[PDB]
Every structure is written in C-alpha cells, then in structure tokens.
From a paper:
In vascular plants, dsRNA Binding Proteins (dsRBPs), DRB7.2 and DRB4, inhibit Dicer-like-protein 3 (DCL3) to stall endogenous inverted-repeat dsRNA (endo-IR dsRNA) mediated gene silencing. Intriguingly, the crucial step of endo-IR dsRNA precursor sequestration is the high affinity complex formation of interacting domains of DRB7.2 (DRB7.2M) and DRB4 (DRB4D3). Next, we establish that DRB7.2 simultaneously interacts with DRB4 and endo-IR dsRNA precursors, where DRB4 contributes towards enhancement in the affinity of the complex with dsRNA, thereby impairing DCL3 mediated cleavage of endo-IR dsRNA precursors. Structural and biochemical studies presented reveal that DRB7.2 harbors two independent surfaces for simultaneous association with DRB4 and dsRNA.
To determine the interaction interface in the complex, we crystallized DRB7.2M:DRB4D3. The data collection and refinement statistics of the complex at 2.9 Å resolution are given in [Table tbl3]. The cell content analysis showed the presence of two protomers, a heterodimer of the DRB7.2M:DRB4D3, in the asymmetric unit. The complex is primarily stabilized by the β3 of DRB7.2M and β1 of DRB4D3 by burying ∼ 20% (1750 Å^2^) of the total accessible surface area (8500 Å^2^) of DRB4D3, signifying strong interaction between DRB7.2M and DRB4D3 ([Fig fig4]). The crystal structure of DRB7.2M:DRB4D3 reveals that V132, E134, and, F136 of the β3 strands of DRB7.2M, and V323 and C325 of the β1 strand of DRB4D3 stabilize the dimerization interface through hydrogen bonding as well as polar contact formed by T131 (DRB7.2M) with G320 (DRB4D3) ([Fig fig4]). Further analysis reveals that the complex is stabilized by an intermolecular salt bridge formed between H322 (DRB4D3) and E134 (DRB7.2M) and a cation-*π* interaction by R326 (DRB4D3) and F136 (DRB7.2M) ([Fig fig4]). The association is also established by the C-terminus of the α2-helix of DRB7.2M with DRB4D3 through a weak *π* - *π* interactions formed by W156 of DRB7.2 with F342 and F347 of DRB4D3 ([Fig fig4]) and hydrophobic interaction between V161 (DRB7.2M) and I317 (DRB4D3) ([Fig fig4]). The structure of the complex indicates that the DRB7.2 dsRBD primarily utilizes the β-sheet region to form an interaction interface with DRB4D3 in which the y-shaped α-helical face is completely excluded. The location of the dsRNA binding site lies on the opposite side of the DRB7.2M:DRB4D3 interface thus giving accessibility of dsRNA to DRB7.2M independent of DRB7.2M’s interaction with DRB4D3.
Author numbering:
A (entry chain A): 83 to 164
B (entry chain D): 306 to 354
Write the structure that this text describes.
Amino acid sequence: SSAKSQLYNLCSVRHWKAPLYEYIAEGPCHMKIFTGKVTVEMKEDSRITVLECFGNPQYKKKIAAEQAAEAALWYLKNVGLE
Amino acid sequence: KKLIMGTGHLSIPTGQHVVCRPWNPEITLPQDAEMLFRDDKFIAYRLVK
C-alpha cells in the first residue's frame, strides 16, 4: 500500500480535508527536479493545525509526492495517529 | 536532547503552522524555524510569526 493512499485514508477516517499536493520545480529546462509538498489540515477538537510536509527532490513528481506523503505519515505516527 | 521512546506520543502544537522535511545533517532552517523534534530521517518544526 502506497504512503500517498495511506495518508488519504487517514485523512477521511478522521473527517479531515483531503490532502493537497503541490510541487517546487528547480533546474534548467533539460533537467527538472521536483520537490513534493503535501498539506494536511489537522482538525483536533474543532481547531485546525496546518501540516506542511516536503520530501527530497526527485526526478518524477510521483516519486516526489509519495515521499512528501511519507513525511506527513512520519509526523502523524509520532503524534499518535493512523 | 536524546529521548528513547516507548509507547508515548507527542503533542500537536495546536493551531500553529507545522512543517516536516527530510533531515540532512547539513540542512539549513529558515530564520523563523523552531525545531520541534527529529529522528535521523525527518525533522519537524514551526515558524515564529
């Protein structure tokens, strides 16, 4: 199971907005590296904390977004969530 | 500093702005960065304003 989908599941199961993915793109046009950014809106007892997670730069957006999700999961596990 | 973890959890800094990147020993955090916690694979922090 992919970390991108696990983060989606976690987000609905807790009645959260679905996570949003953006991308920073660096380099000349013939070599673009992508950094994944995922935003999760953490709702805890009716108040919201915004979680912004990045991964490392990858050559494929898909791998870059996966790693962003994987960072979000890391943080959410460490604060006792699933 | 170091803190082995059993079955504890961490608090959410409720209502602020939290950021997590992969951690690399020669990373640079921005001015407003306040490290919350990290292992040796990721790091979490927040901003001042």
